[PDB]
Amino acid sequence: RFDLVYLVLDKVDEKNDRELAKHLTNLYLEDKPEHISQDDVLPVEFLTMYISYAKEHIHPIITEAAKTELVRAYVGMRKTRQLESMIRLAEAHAKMKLKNVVELEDVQEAVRLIRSAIKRKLQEDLSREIMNVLKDQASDSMSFNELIKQINEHSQDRVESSDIQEALSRLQQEDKVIVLGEGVRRS
Amino acid sequence: EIYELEKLNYIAKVFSKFVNNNSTRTRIAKLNIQQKLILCTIIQSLKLNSDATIDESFDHYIKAITKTDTLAPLQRNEFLEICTILETCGLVSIKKTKCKGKTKRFVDKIDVDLDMREFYDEMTKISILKPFL
């Protein structure tokens, strides 16, 4: 039901964070930012006047001409809250750039927006094993210990007992499996 | 002719050629402390007792050196030269073993002549490989 989510994850690497540190020290290069005016940047007082004029002077209509590109934009997430969010997103796209009629190109970017804003082995084996020791337990509970034991029992992908603890917590809390007792483990 | 060259003495001369590097001259082979790090890196990849490529070793070399930041991660080409320093002393041998996908294709499987008992003595003296174990 949320209209817009935002993955604001960093994913640290080179030739990015270097520009981040350079831009944070570029205003530390001079003691006063008097040199902030020679760039493509609107002032705040002009921006709020343009925004206040556009919010109270434009009532854009969503025509039927942008029907065809909306249907297919919905089925890609379907293969009604997203549709209600994207029509408000498209009319806000129409709210900017002084437009009274919505246009076909304006929803393209809108969808790109919601597609760029959002961009298993572990638990699987976990459950798998849980099932196993259940079966071999005559369905009785798997122990914390035996769990950890068989699960590190394989050298391949290193399931650390802490990670174990975590994913376990996940499934149980995900309600898939039930575990009880501080000192014991239940399948 | 040795007593002519000097103008079971020789069996004593010939067995020390064969017995050493495991007890003593292992550290002779690894004057580089990174060569000590890369030697433990091979054995950590030997958990998956597989065709120990120079890449799967390089896989475990990067994914451990990003966790413990003992040094910067080096090149694969550097990783090629450093394991050959391990080679010429006679510790690890490299052979072009078998994989049969397209043709008889040669990936390189290594094998070490050291044991964990002769490993654990020479690493407790250096607590920088102690993060890595």
XYZ file of all heavy atoms in Angstrom, chain A residues 132-175, unseen atoms left out:
220
model
N 14.970 -33.028 7.735
C 15.665 -34.292 7.818
C 15.680 -34.801 9.245
O 15.159 -35.879 9.527
C 17.081 -34.127 7.289
N 16.234 -34.018 10.158
C 16.358 -34.463 11.531
C 14.994 -34.681 12.132
O 14.830 -35.495 13.042
C 17.175 -33.447 12.343
N 13.996 -33.945 11.665
C 12.639 -34.283 12.039
C 12.354 -35.717 11.645
O 12.135 -36.582 12.498
C 11.668 -33.330 11.356
N 12.461 -35.993 10.350
C 12.188 -37.319 9.837
C 12.934 -38.369 10.639
O 12.335 -39.283 11.212
C 12.576 -37.379 8.362
N 14.238 -38.205 10.748
C 15.088 -39.138 11.457
C 14.867 -39.112 12.957
O 15.420 -39.956 13.664
C 16.551 -38.833 11.137
N 14.093 -38.162 13.463
C 13.771 -38.056 14.877
C 12.438 -38.712 15.161
O 11.857 -38.521 16.232
C 13.756 -36.604 15.339
N 11.905 -39.421 14.172
C 10.505 -39.792 14.152
C 9.639 -38.567 14.306
O 8.604 -38.617 14.982
C 10.174 -40.826 15.232
N 10.109 -37.464 13.713
C 9.453 -36.163 13.706
C 9.741 -35.391 14.981
O 9.281 -34.254 15.131
C 7.945 -36.288 13.490
N 10.506 -35.964 15.900
C 10.752 -35.185 17.096
C 11.633 -33.990 16.749
O 12.114 -33.841 15.622
C 11.406 -36.044 18.171
N 11.846 -33.134 17.742
C 12.474 -31.851 17.478
C 13.934 -32.040 17.112
O 14.604 -32.956 17.593
C 12.358 -30.934 18.694
N 14.421 -31.180 16.230
C 15.853 -31.089 16.010
C 16.464 -30.270 17.133
O 15.861 -29.303 17.599
C 16.156 -30.458 14.654
N 17.639 -30.681 17.587
C 18.328 -29.966 18.643
C 19.106 -28.805 18.065
O 19.628 -28.875 16.953
C 19.284 -30.886 19.384
N 19.194 -27.740 18.855
C 20.157 -26.698 18.540
C 21.477 -27.315 18.176
O 22.046 -27.038 17.119
C 20.357 -25.791 19.749
N 21.947 -28.202 19.033
C 23.261 -28.762 18.848
C 23.343 -29.520 17.541
O 24.123 -29.161 16.661
C 23.579 -29.669 20.021
N 22.516 -30.547 17.383
C 22.614 -31.371 16.190
C 22.460 -30.523 14.953
O 23.144 -30.738 13.949
C 21.547 -32.450 16.210
N 21.560 -29.555 15.019
C 21.440 -28.596 13.939
C 22.795 -28.012 13.600
O 23.335 -28.244 12.512
C 20.473 -27.497 14.348
N 23.368 -27.275 14.544
C 24.656 -26.642 14.312
C 25.649 -27.666 13.798
O 26.483 -27.384 12.932
C 25.154 -25.978 15.606
N 25.517 -28.891 14.282
C 26.501 -29.922 14.027
C 26.466 -30.369 12.582
O 27.491 -30.384 11.902
C 26.241 -31.102 14.948
N 25.303 -30.771 12.108
C 25.200 -31.174 10.726
C 25.429 -30.006 9.791
O 25.926 -30.206 8.678
C 23.830 -31.791 10.478
N 25.098 -28.796 10.240
C 25.123 -27.608 9.394
C 26.518 -27.060 9.189
O 26.820 -26.540 8.104
C 24.221 -26.502 9.976
N 27.368 -27.112 10.198
C 28.772 -26.914 9.908
C 29.362 -28.190 9.325
O 30.348 -28.142 8.591
C 29.506 -26.497 11.178
N 28.689 -29.312 9.583
C 29.093 -30.642 9.104
C 29.574 -30.691 7.648
O 30.250 -31.636 7.243
C 27.954 -31.646 9.308
N 29.220 -29.672 6.870
C 29.653 -29.587 5.479
C 30.625 -28.419 5.320
O 30.290 -27.274 5.622
C 28.451 -29.409 4.551
N 31.830 -28.720 4.845
C 32.875 -27.715 4.647
C 32.557 -26.651 3.594
O 32.872 -25.476 3.779
C 34.205 -28.396 4.311
N 31.949 -27.090 2.495
C 31.590 -26.250 1.344
C 31.208 -24.783 1.591
O 32.006 -23.876 1.347
C 30.484 -26.930 0.528
N 29.984 -24.557 2.055
C 29.487 -23.213 2.293
C 29.401 -23.057 3.796
O 28.691 -23.806 4.472
C 28.121 -22.991 1.640
N 30.102 -22.073 4.336
C 30.443 -22.172 5.740
C 29.317 -21.524 6.515
O 29.215 -20.305 6.659
C 31.777 -21.501 6.015
N 28.504 -22.385 7.114
C 27.379 -21.891 7.879
C 27.923 -21.715 9.280
O 28.187 -22.680 9.992
C 26.190 -22.850 7.849
N 28.104 -20.473 9.662
C 28.590 -20.193 10.985
C 27.425 -20.293 11.942
O 26.316 -19.827 11.660
C 29.231 -18.816 11.045
N 27.685 -20.929 13.076
C 26.645 -21.162 14.060
C 25.920 -19.882 14.430
O 24.765 -19.926 14.856
C 27.253 -21.800 15.305
N 26.580 -18.736 14.311
C 25.872 -17.485 14.519
C 24.921 -17.220 13.377
O 23.740 -16.943 13.587
C 26.867 -16.340 14.644
N 25.440 -17.264 12.161
C 24.580 -17.205 11.004
C 23.475 -18.218 11.120
O 22.307 -17.893 10.890
C 25.405 -17.468 9.755
N 23.838 -19.433 11.512
C 22.835 -20.439 11.799
C 21.783 -19.861 12.727
O 20.595 -19.809 12.393
C 23.504 -21.685 12.405
N 22.221 -19.351 13.872
C 21.294 -18.792 14.841
C 20.393 -17.773 14.180
O 19.182 -17.741 14.410
C 22.075 -18.157 15.983
N 20.970 -16.968 13.313
C 20.219 -15.895 12.710
C 19.147 -16.431 11.787
O 17.968 -16.121 11.952
C 21.173 -14.984 11.957
N 19.534 -17.230 10.806
C 18.554 -17.721 9.853
C 17.483 -18.524 10.554
O 16.296 -18.422 10.224
C 19.238 -18.571 8.797
N 17.897 -19.344 11.506
C 16.947 -20.069 12.328
C 15.930 -19.121 12.902
O 14.717 -19.271 12.703
C 17.694 -20.773 13.454
N 16.431 -18.114 13.604
C 15.574 -17.068 14.105
C 14.633 -16.599 13.012
O 13.428 -16.465 13.230
C 16.435 -15.927 14.628
N 15.158 -16.435 11.807
C 14.337 -15.922 10.725
C 13.168 -16.849 10.437
O 12.010 -16.431 10.491
C 15.191 -15.723 9.481
N 13.450 -18.109 10.157
C 12.381 -19.025 9.807
C 11.366 -19.135 10.926
O 10.156 -19.099 10.686
C 12.963 -20.389 9.486
N 11.844 -19.268 12.155
C 10.919 -19.391 13.262
C 10.039 -18.174 13.333
O 8.811 -18.269 13.272
C 11.678 -19.595 14.569
N 10.662 -17.018 13.433
C 9.974 -15.753 13.348
C 9.192 -15.614 12.061
O 8.132 -14.986 12.064
C 10.983 -14.619 13.464
N 9.674 -16.181 10.966
C 8.868 -16.235 9.765
C 7.745 -17.234 9.919
O 6.932 -17.393 9.006
C 9.724 -16.585 8.556
N 7.723 -17.871 11.095
C 6.756 -18.898 11.529
C 6.845 -20.252 10.807
O 6.018 -21.136 11.031
C 5.309 -18.372 11.590
